Homo-oligomer: A and B are copies of this chain.
């Protein structure tokens, strides 16, 4: 073997901590080293040219670069090694900047030089034993899955379908739309939410390239970037679509959404779409604008009285004995768009959320103010049904809170939606006054500051003080809000008819279960984690899975849609190519060393190992597609019958031996 050692200065970031000349001379005197040389910026085009010229001149077998981190510049120098007539995987780095210079800057120079010599020696020892690998290319199934039917899921599904990829849209609830379907008007443009979204819901429902699967969950996921074998649970909806009815043999059809079933059902239960304010029968739709207008049956609350089937009549859409059906679907990529729920604000006892009647939260206020809600769009007091004339908005309710009860982060949109609600009350109830108890108004987006200016102009009162506690008047049920006006410098006691809490948001229910099924990690905040927080906010570390929407962190509908289309583009990249290259770190069983004990088989989380027949002997078989290169099996096998392709035992032991060489 013939190895070249190229030591970067990183423009004095390394030459200001060690003696590069001494490191280079030591590399020259090292065994197996053909050429040792240095340059100011080895990651720059003259640096790659230097590598390539050295390879051609000295007939180099391998290249060692004493530079920054591999996690930073493996692709660069692997491509530089390829261009030059070598394999990309005859290359090895020695991290002498982020683990030598930046940590041994001060007052210790010959010690850092000795550390650099040791790292270069270990790198040369490994590279003298590296050999050729070729990355595995795997086919990509031409379908995609989008979990979540909110705005982010619908946008991602429409984007993929219009790019031409067949797409599955999984929604746990009987309708698509998400939270934006519950919103009444939207900041800062004050458009009606359903009006702007109903068009896109119709597009999703009609698109031939979208397989809209509502009221369905994801039981299990196995596979990788190539093929994800996703098992879906089709929950017993209880009612048949026209297509399914015709398939089952009923010519007359399935559900046409007439409503006779819910007209005759005698069970009455709260509506989760209306946050519980409104009744709905056992057979029901959330609202009149649901996209699949198919009238789910709630089997936890149905009493099987059979009146619904008599009402449905010849359509015969209702099957009261339906059971959870399971389907297995193979997909190439997956997009996660699970959204969010409101943090449980009844834990903050000083604001009497559950204990005082006239304290509500912002999604209940949005349903109360919507014209399609339980009221006729008239905001009335829950305690007595009278119209409020003073409304308080507690901003930051459970947010930027380090006490362990609330969330330590900002929920991003709660300042903006509180401004919207203040405007809505001041314009819908004549003479009503809105009080916002705020602590940093955050109107940062496009036209947001102008919206804030307009709300103040219309006459909302802004009191800069976090609410301390809330007391309920025993007779009028009015709410006494106690805080300090920090700018005025005095305590205040504002008595309002209705108190609205701008509660924090948290990941939806079951989101952690789903992201563990797909292999995604979590952030410090508890939201799903992205591949690189700056330059890759959509992709995750597990290949073939992408994030979209509030599930990655709270955001407004504009930012959510931008993120969703970005995720759709990233998921389309490998589908359009049809190939994708895996990293050749796989385990390879050496059969004439395997003894067939089968003990390694249970050490693989991905089930890549199995016992099979080769030449009569029972040996172990690696599904090289399923292997991920962790190395657990190869670190276990006592006989050394498992070889890890770029981190083989001879290579690692050569590194150890070179460290102890003196």
A→B interface (CB under 8 Å): 11, 13, 40-41, 43-46, 49, 68, 72-73, 75-76, 79, 151, 155, 159, 162-164, 186, 188-189, 191, 195-200, 202, 206, 256-258, 288-289, 293, 371-372, 400, 402, 408-410, 412, 440-450, 453, 486-487, 489, 523-525, 527, 532-538, 552-553, 557-559, 561-566, 568-570, 572-573, 576-577
Residues of chain B within 8 A (CB-CB) of A569 are 159, 163, 565-566, 568-569, 572
A–B pairs, 27, beta carbons within 8 Å? A43-B198, A44-B288, A45-B256, A46-B256, A46-B293, A68-B195, A75-B199, A155-B535, A189-B534, A196-B534, A196-B535, A409-B449, A410-B448, A412-B445, A440-B442, A446-B523, A446-B533, A447-B525, A486-B487, A487-B487, A534-B558, A536-B561, A537-B558, A559-B562, A562-B563, A565-B566, A576-B576
A620 to nearest B CB, angstroms? 37
Residues of chain B within 8 A (CB-CB) of A453 are 402, 408
In whole angstroms, what is the CA distance A75 to B206 when docked? 12
In whole angstroms, what is the CA distance A517 to B216 when docked? 49
The answer on a CB contact under 8 Å between B189 and A533 is yes
The answer on a CB contact under 8 Å between A191 and B577 is no
A48 to nearest B CB, angstroms? 9
Contact of A79 among B155, B206, B372, B568 (CB under 8 A): B206
Residues of chain B within 8 A (CB-CB) of A73 are 199
**Known: A79-B206, A534-B191. Contact between A561 and B566, CB under 8 A?**
yes
In whole angstroms, what is the CA distance A400 to B453 when docked? 9
The answer on a CB contact under 8 Å between A412 and B563 is no
A84 to nearest B CB, angstroms? 14
In whole angstroms, what is the CA distance A376 to B372 when docked? 64
Contact of A46 among B163, B257, B525 (CB under 8 A): B257
Residues of chain B within 8 A (CB-CB) of A256 are 45-46, 49
The answer on a CB contact under 8 Å between A565 and B553 is no
The answer on a CB contact under 8 Å between B576 and A197 is no
A158 to nearest B CB, angstroms? 10
**Known: A164-B577, A562-B538. Contact between A525 and B446, CB under 8 A?**
yes
The answer on a CB contact under 8 Å between B573 and A162 is yes
In whole angstroms, what is the CA distance A471 to B415 when docked? 36
The answer on a CB contact under 8 Å between A412 and B444 is yes
Contact of A200 among B162, B188, B489, B535 (CB under 8 A): B535
The answer on a CB contact under 8 Å between A45 and B257 is yes
A418 to nearest B CB, angstroms? 14
A416 to nearest B CB, angstroms? 10
Among A448, A449, A489, A563, residue most surrounded by chain B Cβ atoms (within 10 Å): A449
**Known: A256-B49, A288-B41. Contact between A372 and B11, CB under 8 A?**
yes
Residues of chain B within 8 A (CB-CB) of A75 are 199
In whole angstroms, what is the CA distance A446 to B537 when docked? 11
Contact of A76 among B46, B199, B536 (CB under 8 A): B199
A198 to nearest B CB, angstroms? 6
The answer on a CB contact under 8 Å between B46 and A534 is no
The answer on a CB contact under 8 Å between B293 and A534 is no
In whole angstroms, what is the CA distance A191 to B525 when docked? 19
In whole angstroms, what is the CA distance A402 to B454 when docked? 13
The answer on a CB contact under 8 Å between B163 and A572 is yes
Residues of chain B within 8 A (CB-CB) of A41 are 288-289
Among A46, A440, A489, residue most surrounded by chain B Cβ atoms (within 10 Å): A440
In whole angstroms, what is the CA distance A257 to B523 when docked? 43
Closest-by-CB residue of B relative to A83 is B206
A186 to nearest B CB, angstroms? 6
Residues of chain B within 8 A (CB-CB) of A489 are 489
Give 10 nearest A-B pairs by CB, closest first: A565-B566, A569-B569, A446-B553, A562-B566, A537-B558, A565-B569, A562-B562, A562-B563, A566-B566, A409-B449
The answer on a CB contact under 8 Å between A446 and B527 is yes
Closest-by-CB residue of B relative to A529 is B446
In whole angstroms, what is the CA distance A361 to B409 when docked? 29
Contact of A450 among B151, B409, B445, B559 (CB under 8 A): B409
Residues of chain B within 8 A (CB-CB) of A553 are 445-446
Among A43, A159, A162, A446, residue most surrounded by chain B Cβ atoms (within 10 Å): A446
A549 to nearest B CB, angstroms? 11
The answer on a CB contact under 8 Å between A408 and B450 is yes
The answer on a CB contact under 8 Å between B561 and A535 is yes
Residues of chain B within 8 A (CB-CB) of A533 are 188-189, 446-447, 558
Residues of chain B within 8 A (CB-CB) of A189 are 533-534
Closest-by-CB residue of B relative to A558 is B537
Residues of chain B within 8 A (CB-CB) of A163 are 569, 572-573, 576
Residues of chain B within 8 A (CB-CB) of A188 are 533
Contact of A13 among B46, B371, B408 (CB under 8 A): B371
Among A151, A189, A576, residue most surrounded by chain B Cβ atoms (within 10 Å): A576
Residues of chain B within 8 A (CB-CB) of A576 are 163-164, 576
The answer on a CB contact under 8 Å between B410 and A444 is yes
Residues of chain B within 8 A (CB-CB) of A573 are 159, 162-163
Closest-by-CB residue of B relative to A79 is B206
Closest-by-CB residue of B relative to A438 is B440
The answer on a CB contact under 8 Å between A537 and B523 is no
A107 to nearest B CB, angstroms? 15
